[PDB]
Amino acid sequence: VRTYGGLKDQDRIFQNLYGRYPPDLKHAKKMGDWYKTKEILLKGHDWIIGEIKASGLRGRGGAGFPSGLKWSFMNFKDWDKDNKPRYLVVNADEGEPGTCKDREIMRKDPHKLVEGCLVAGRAMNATAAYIYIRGEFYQEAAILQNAINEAYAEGLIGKNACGSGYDFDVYIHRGAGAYVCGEETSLIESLEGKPGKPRLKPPFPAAVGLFGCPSTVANVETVSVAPTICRRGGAWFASFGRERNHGTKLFCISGHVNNPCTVEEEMSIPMRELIEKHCGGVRGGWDNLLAVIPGGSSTPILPKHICDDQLMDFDALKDSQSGLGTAAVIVMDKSTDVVRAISRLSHFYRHESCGQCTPCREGSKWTDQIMKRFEKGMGRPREIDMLQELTKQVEGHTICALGEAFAWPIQGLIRHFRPELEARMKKFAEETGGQALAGGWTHDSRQKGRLVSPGM
Amino acid sequence: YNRNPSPGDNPPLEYTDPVTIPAGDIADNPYWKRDFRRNYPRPSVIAQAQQVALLSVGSAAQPRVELIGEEGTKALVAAEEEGKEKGVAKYLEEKGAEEAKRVLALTGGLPPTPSGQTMVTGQWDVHKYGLAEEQSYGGSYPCRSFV
Amino acid sequence: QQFSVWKDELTIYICPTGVIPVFSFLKYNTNAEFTQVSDITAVDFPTREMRFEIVYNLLSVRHNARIRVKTYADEVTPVPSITSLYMGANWYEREVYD
Amino acid sequence: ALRRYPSGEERCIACKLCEAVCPAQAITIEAEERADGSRRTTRYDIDMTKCIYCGFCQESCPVDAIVESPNAEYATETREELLYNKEKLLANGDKWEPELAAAIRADAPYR
Amino acid sequence: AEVELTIDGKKVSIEAGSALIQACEKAGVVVPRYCYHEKLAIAGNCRMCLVEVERSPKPVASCAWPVQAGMVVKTNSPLTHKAREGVMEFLLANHPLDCPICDQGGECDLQDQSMRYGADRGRFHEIGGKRAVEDKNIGPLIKTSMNRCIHCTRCVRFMNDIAGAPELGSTGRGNDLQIGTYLEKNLDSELSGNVIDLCPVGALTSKPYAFR
Amino acid sequence: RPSFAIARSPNEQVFPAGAFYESILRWNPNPV
Amino acid sequence: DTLMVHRNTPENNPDIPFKFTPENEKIIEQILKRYPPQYKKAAVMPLLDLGQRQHGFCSISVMNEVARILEMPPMRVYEVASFYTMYNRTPVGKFHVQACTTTPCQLGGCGSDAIVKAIKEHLGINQGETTPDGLFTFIEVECLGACVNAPMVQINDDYYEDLTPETIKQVLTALKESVNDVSKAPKPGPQSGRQSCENSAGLTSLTSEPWGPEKTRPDL
Amino acid sequence: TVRIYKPAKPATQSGEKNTQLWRMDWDVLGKGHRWENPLMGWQSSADFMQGTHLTFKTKEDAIAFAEKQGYEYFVQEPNERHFRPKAYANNFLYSPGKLKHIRTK
Ligand SMILES: Cc1cc2nc3c(=O)[nH]c(=O)nc-3n(C[C@H](O)[C@H](O)[C@H](O)COP(=O)(O)O)c2cc1C
Ligand code: SF4
Ligand code: SF4
Ligand code: SF4
Ligand code: SF4
Ligand code: SF4
Ligand code: FES
């Protein structure tokens, strides 16, 4: 049939990923940026939306939602009649552990994003774009703004974008250190001037978004690829990838490989095909692999024998009870404490929770305390089942998707490494002289005169 | 041997307060499967109107008429309407002694006997009181033993 | 007037003037051989026009069965005595009255 | 008897649970904030002629503050002597503490 | 206008544009709540009002869900039952065992709805312990036992919107989120004692009626 | 008690403004 | 030991005055015009950073000034500054060392644990305090977005990345020497050859000359 | 005199189980309701009706009982709410002009 992967250099998108050119506008025009943007703007927003519809573009923020459909949600029946401003909010906060794509997009090829704000904007016919950058990416923001100034200076963005009679302007709003501030309703509130606690939807942001105005939040990489798919065609984009997994995409290959880096590659590339061809191989050889976290901290860990013949896309990873997330492929060796790796993530999720809702503000700490115990083995194996259904109590009950973000990693670790955990409990149960009580108290706890309720 | 040691010297640490696995477990018992207090039975009430309808059109276990689709719903109120208007006494008077035989035909042509309260045989029933194999006074005293 | 069933208990709801016929049928019927009064008591419901519910509990040693009979009364509305049928009911009615 | 901690503070924090569960309404409690800000009783009366010696008051305690000692020998002359106020019930606990602690030590696993 | 809808079978007639919890009240259906108050803005933080709605993969928060012309709501389905026990288990994992010393004892919504919608026992036994937070000085009338805070936001909503006294807030993040003025200040509002009644729990009590 | 990078005088600049805030000054929506 | 309530201090008390310098308000004006005129409360985040880069940390007086510029109740500003981590509500060192200890850095290349170990033994301090001479305040942080360049430690506004126990020591020392002569300040980014994120053993892709606008659909 | 009323919901909590039934209770008198016991400080009473209350399903059921027993009765009509549609979406309505409110969740 058809084998996916190894696309040529002449079908790539982010050419300047390795810093071969300075980020100034003059070199950007050599790369095709701002080439036919005037003709693109004159064509109606329907043409832009339908083009991204045919390309099969799905959001690389993590949910993977169809992109043309999402942007078209903002074009309601009587959108013209309302006098309120319309906003394109751009998700430049990349806080997902293992992820580094957008840092490269803004620091290397900024004018691609800058035109993407207009083209995504004109699509959803917004009147202003906001770029919410991670607060740590202070150097990245300065580059991106300098790109914006030249975009205003040359007339590309402003009161008359490329002479098209369109009103669009671009502003950057840096964050201040909150991973919850990547969630789309949390991203709205933070830019509004509040703590970044997410809103609940039935109110959907395409209607009541930023300052209660119609807005769309889209990730950097999704926005940045829009201008090229317009100028090159969505059929050409849809050439790459499987039937519902089209396009190229940026992969962060970090962890236990010989040469960790980030490279863009066609969707549905097999996991095997990717790491030892674009990254020098896993350290110690393929047989010395243990597990791969495919989409970042949120997606469940994937062991050796499942990752043997696994394609890296949205559908195959979802089929494997995992996800592509942002394809922050974290790869771990056979000589590393896997359980310690996941307990450091449930510690990450404890620190990033906003605290607004009960099942996450309490649950992200409860599971973090449990994971440090399972790290030491201070428990009985029945606790493993208790931790499985604590997480099921978290999914779907929270205001935002940061609840699943800390339930999924634990569920994967129980699903594929339960022999590991029970061994550590057995090692603990050997050392102190008996199976610990549920909670981490030693077997002699009642003997030593401590509170021990019947049952733990 | 007797009351030795006292309960005051019985070792506190030896005794164990038990839990049973289903109800006392930490990991496979949602409380709402085992909340039988809130799954209590309601009292099932049948008035004279209800029994007129039950004889008129049957029961969800056994109908008198097919009651297919429409023109059966209006027959279902025909059972309910006749019940309020007339008791079981008017109903039996006017449709004749034929359906006085039918009330007994529900329990096989005899009146039903009431339910017993034992189920030691597996079915609700009277207890079969019989003389025990060996009598404790023998025949020597006016007192028999019953099993 | 009606009958209810809760678990193993069948209750019969009767008109106050039917007291003598109903208890006669439940005393002298061959399928209703309920020859003991176990208890006669009242319950008070001041939210009803007839305040008092009269509860009779009867036992059938023949059929190993129990039946409850309920009727109603008022501050001025009297109930037939059943000491014509059960000698044991005499002191119970004195209690309900008292 | 009303008991203390090893420190010497009264165990009683005036929850009033023993007052709610009393079958015979024999307990009357009035509480407020002590000078140091602690939640403590100002009144603690037990009508020894209303009490049925059920032990419910001591099953409901969350701090083992109220107990029933093994003392059965306290017939008195007047029944005014049978209105125990908080000064007598604390004096009883000070008197009976070794035996109270011993009976609690025996029965705690079953409680 | 009036939409019509079914909740546990029964048709209710509620004005369009109102929340589902308002129609559940009108339909004679008790829905557990902590954050939602009839006279305060809708907040979806507690998660105790999660109900099952036809054509919705997740449980919805009934307090924030607008009523639609034809929806079906099951409030007693097994989806709803395990939802409420899971929230009641989370709301009690870090809650202080302070019911004998709490003034809200005997009139507490956390206690009653734990008895009605929670599990009978608890599964929190961490050797690492529970959360504990320092107390806050917010004037003479209100005594604070903040360990008891369940983060409903009822008082910040009352003080900011009804009293017009925006000195109470919520500083921090995650499990370390705390209610109180960042710098100790005397809540200056002739309506401030309403926060004590609004509190579902005894984290805001009255200093005069301290333990009497 | 150890010294900290706290501004002493009211018109002292403890930390540089940096590149990002420097480029904000050059921003002007009017085309040149 | 970060606290979420205000502790009164001779260096952090409301009575100390703060005002933005006769040079900062120009930056303030440009920031304000980037939002709807009535929604100036959107600017709270930029001015808190401007306030703490002029004073040293987000003091109670700093936060209170930003409140009156934006007509906000100050408690609305306390919730922001307490929510977002980058705001420092307690005085910090000259160099605020931020070592990432999240799983990817814990496995990436050499682990971050040696990098924390190197920092600790060289700086002679534990987690979260400052050095006695008051130049380095060292804390650990969550993923900073340079995972393929693990392990990495950002200091003030720059990312010293791909660190080893030997390299992190000299990066810190020259930074200490930078207080006098700016010539000795270490260059940012990663060490050991990598420019930003490329492959460390030759470029796998992007070798041919880039394609320009020549391959564009003709209808457009 | 007795008061027939529907008990109001506690301000302290949101359960309304006790507001569902009408209560008939006796009014307190100016003397004889409570005095201090000289000996133990207990509260003594002469009011034999102080701890007695009646529950009724409807108002007319309570009135019928009061007149049947010859009580004097004052009926208090329940206070009910005024329905108003509440929408989470309003929390984020757009202000064209001055804000006049900074919503803080
Ligand atoms: C807890 C949480 C964190 C998120 N973090 C990020 C992030 O760091 N970067 C990002 O691009 N999207 C992030 N997202 C996803 C966004 O909410 C949003 O879906 C996406 O940025 C834009 O959608 P699109 O990619 O489909 O266009 C996060 C979502 C959640 C729930
Ligand atoms: S899931 Fe966690 S981060 Fe998301 S709203 Fe709830 S508490 Fe906040
Ligand atoms: S003795 Fe115990 S139950 Fe009684 S008031 Fe004191 S603490 Fe409460
Ligand atoms: S033992 Fe006496 S004082 Fe204690 S609860 Fe029983 S009756 Fe009351
Ligand atoms: S607030 Fe309620 S549940 Fe919490 S301690 Fe007080 S009485 Fe108990
Ligand atoms: S103090 Fe009380 S009212 Fe305020 S958030 Fe906490 S629990 Fe809610
Ligand atoms: S009641 Fe809707 S979430 Fe609290």
Ligand code: FES
């Ligand atoms: S893990 Fe340290 S930068 Fe992402």
